[PDB]
Design a protein around this ligand. Structure first.
Ligand SMILES: O=C(O)[C@@H]1[C@@H](O)[C@H](O)[C@@H](O)c2nc(CCc3ccc(C(F)(F)F)cc3)cn21
Lengths: 385, 74
């Protein structure tokens, strides 16, 4: 099913330029399957890459291996966590001797944890946990072939994530407490995503929920599969046009700050109504320290209204309500922000995202199967300053 | 009820995310597309990419362990 391929100095250049010119920090997954007689990682191909990168002035972070728990199934080779840790140590040494000795190193990009994936992670962290700057693991909700539209709307499904996060932290905290944890690769469904779902407005429920829970539960960075590519779960389609999840992602960026607060609904049942709370993003010129951003997901089949704790109940709020552009409903690939459809202006020009200013005190309308952000202006929350 | 009341906790932040909290990836298998270089040159695509700055861009996937550097390759 899978054999080796090559790439060029040119490919590397392209990839780097893409990142640098687009304001992004590149993380590069090295090949961990190049092995010696005694099955230690043979680091000599990586040596060439590092040397070339040095010679070009490239600032780059590195990973080694991908879903090493599956190596036996993917390539008839088992590498134990202890050995993989040793290999990460070898990589550490090489990075130290290179022109950028403060290059970051992340790993081991294991899959979501069943019994032995967790055991492999543990032994990895024991052996090599000291040289990695963050712990990376991956997670998907479903199989892309068996996922139904109803699954993308089911809260019970979304909450299987909760148990996964915790299981990982359990392992980390038992071996390298206080170490950062990253979601290294994650999306809606595996096997390229579920066709005519992972690319629609319907995918936003899982995507927004995932960010919400990740933030709350202590995940510092979330890596979405993929920015663009073959898979159904791309953010940008093959025509290089943005999908619903892109516009959602862009909007999240403008509005949500780094500090993580919390919200919940009073009544026990909120499984279908999910809510999340951070400080507002400081950089937005419209807003100021102290302002709060609440975001919310409605999986009820009717409109819900949110009522804010006073003093915030009397504050001026901006609505950012996201609705599919019809007439394909939840499986539409176009989306509206407060009743204007979101489109690029041209290929070099993103639109502005216009808020709906609310008269102070106005109740918060959240239609069925929708999501929205609300920025509470002049909230002056001490924690957010 | 169509009205729902919320509990806000705002004493202290529970966690602090990275400024790059929402990050993206490219599958390592895209390196096996012939027109890789052309694709990444797209202005449409780079404008979208800047839209989500700052973020990490992770290049990896199943193919991470089935790729090899070739200094000779053009
Ligand atoms: O399948 C994906 O979309 C992505 C791939 O693109 C990526 O290369 C790779 O990082 C990855 N790991 C997973 C989770 C474990 C897994 C792998 C392969 C299969 C299957 F056999 F279905 F392909 C089922 C579960 C999903 N993915």
């Amino acid at each position: 099913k899978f054999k080796n391929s090559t790439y060029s100095r040119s490919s590397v250049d392209v990839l780097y330029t893409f990142a640098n010119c687009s304001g992004l920090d590149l993380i590069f997954g090295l090949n961990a399957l190049l092995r010696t007689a005694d099955l230690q990682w043979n680091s000599s191909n990586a040596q060439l890459l590092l040397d070339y990168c040095s010679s070009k002035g490239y600032n780059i972070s590195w990973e080694l291996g991908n879903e090493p728990n599956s190596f036996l199934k993917k390539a008839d080779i088992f590498i134990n966590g202890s050995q993989l840790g040793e290999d990460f140590i070898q990589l550490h040494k090489l990075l130290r001797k290179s022109t950028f000795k403060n290059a970051k190193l992340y790993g081991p990009d294991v899959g979501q944890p069943r019994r032995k994936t967790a055991k492999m992670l543990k032994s990895f962290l024991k052996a090599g946990g000291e040289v990695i700057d963050s712990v990376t693991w991956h997670h998907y909700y479903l199989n892309g072939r068996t996922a139904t539209r109803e699954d993308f709307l089911n809260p019970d499904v979304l909450d299987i994530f909760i148990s996964s996060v915790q299981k990982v932290f359990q392992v980390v905290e038992s071996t390298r407490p206080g170490k950062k944890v990253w979601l290294g690769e994650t999306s809606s469904a595996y096997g390229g995503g579920a066709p005519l779902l992972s690319d629609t407005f319907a995918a936003g429920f899982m995507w927004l929920d995932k960010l919400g829970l990740s933030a709350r539960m202590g995940i510092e960075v979330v890596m979405r599969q993929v920015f663009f590519g073959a898979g159904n779960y791309h953010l940008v389609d093959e025509n290089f046009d943005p999908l619903p999840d892109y516009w959602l992602s862009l909007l999240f960026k403008k509005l949500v700050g780094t500090k993580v607060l919390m919200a919940s609904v009073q009544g026990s049942k909120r499984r279908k109504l999910r809510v999340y709370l951070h400080c507002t993003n400081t950089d937005n010129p419209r807003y100021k320290e102290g302002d709060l951003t609440l975001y919310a997901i409605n999986l009820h089949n009717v409109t819900k209204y949110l009522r804010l704790p006073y003093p915030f109940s009397n504050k001026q709020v901006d609505k950012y309500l996201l609705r599919p552009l019809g007439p394909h409903g939840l499986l539409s690939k176009s989306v509206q922000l407060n009743g204007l459809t979101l489109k690029m202006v041209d290929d070099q020009t993103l639109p502005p995202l216009m808020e709906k200013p609310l008269r102070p005190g106005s109740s918060l309308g959240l239609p069925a199967f929708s999501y929205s952000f609300f920025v509470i202006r002049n909230a002056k929350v001490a924690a957010c300053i | 009820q169509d009205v729902v009341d919320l509990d806000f906790f705002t004493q202290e932040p529970l966690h602090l995310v990275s400024p790059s909290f929402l990050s993206v990836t490219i599958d390592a298998n895209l390196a096996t597309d012939p027109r890789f270089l052309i694709l990444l040159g797209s202005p449409k695509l780079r404008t979208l990419a800047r839209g989500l700055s700052p973020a990490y861009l992770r290049f990896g996937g199943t193919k991470t362990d089935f790729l090899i550097f070739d200094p000779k390759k053009e």
